[PDB]
């Protein structure tokens, strides 16, 4: 089992297109794990995949993308579906980070950080994690430093993703150090 490719398939089902797998996510993103497995088994590549394989995929991952609880599974962040995933509001640390591509910096300066295709702006707890986010689009990514606690004190909402991935509503440029 190629766990990296399996994770990409699971991400598509749990973040982007659950309907394509015949799945319906609840308000917090959960779906029955046997329903996900049944849907994965529609694809020739994944007919061997067991629940055990999903736990191992999670255990071996660089990132805490998914969690399995009481026979249900969800993605913790990254969703793009029309129905807003309900996340817990959370006061952020003083500073969070956002790694991006050079070609987006002018637009972020003018408009702030926007959720774009996702439901939430995604932020990083540390510099190295943020640079890895930016490296997905740019070999020379730009580190943005977000005055997150200041933004929160002025009404910008932040939400729990995981220990390394923070979520937010749109963040005005005034809170972003370039
Ligand atoms: N006003 C504006 N004008 C122009 N561009 C703007 C803009 N505001 C923001 N942008 C940029 O628009 C891109 C959005 O791109 P994305 O939706 O992929 O967000 P992201 O890059 O944060 O990545 C999410 C997670 O996906 C991966 O997680 P996984 O590995 O899949 O688990 C990562 O690790 C993350 O945690 C980003 O470049 C923004 O900088």
Author numbering: 4 to 181
Quote the study on this structure.
Tpt1 is a fascinating enzyme that transfers an internal RNA 2′-monophosphate (2′-PO4) to NAD+ to form a 2′-OH RNA and ADP-ribose-1″,2″-cyclic phosphate. The Tpt1 mechanism comprises two chemical steps in which: (i) the RNA 2′-PO4 reacts with NAD+ to expel nicotinamide and form a 2′-phospho-ADP-ribosylated RNA intermediate; and (ii) transesterification of the ADP-ribose 2′′-OH to the RNA 2′-PO4 displaces the RNA 2′-OH and generates ADP-ribose-1″,2″-cyclic phosphate. We succeeded in growing crystals of Tpt1 from the mesothermophilic bacterium Clostridium thermocellum (Cth) using recombinant CthTpt1 produced in E. coli. Hexagonal CthTpt1 crystals were in space group P6122 and diffracted X-rays to 1.4 Å resolution. The refined Tpt1 structure (Rwork/Rfree 16.16/18.57) comprised a continuous polypeptide from Leu3 to Glu182, consisting of nine β strands, six α helices, and four 310 helices, organized into two distinct lobes spanning amino acids 1–85 and 86–182, respectively.
The Cys46 residue of CthTpt1, to which CoA is attached, is conspicuously not conserved in other Tpt1 homologs, thereby underscoring the serendipity of covalent capture of CoA bound to CthTpt1. To explore this point, we mutated Cys46 to serine, produced Tpt1-C46S in E. coli, crystallized the C46S mutant, and determined its structure at 1.6 Å resolution. The Tpt1-C46S structure was notable for the following: (i) its tertiary structure was virtually identical to that of wild-type Tpt1; (ii) ADP-ribose-1″-phosphate was bound to the NAD+ lobe; and (iii) CoA was absent from the RNA lobe.
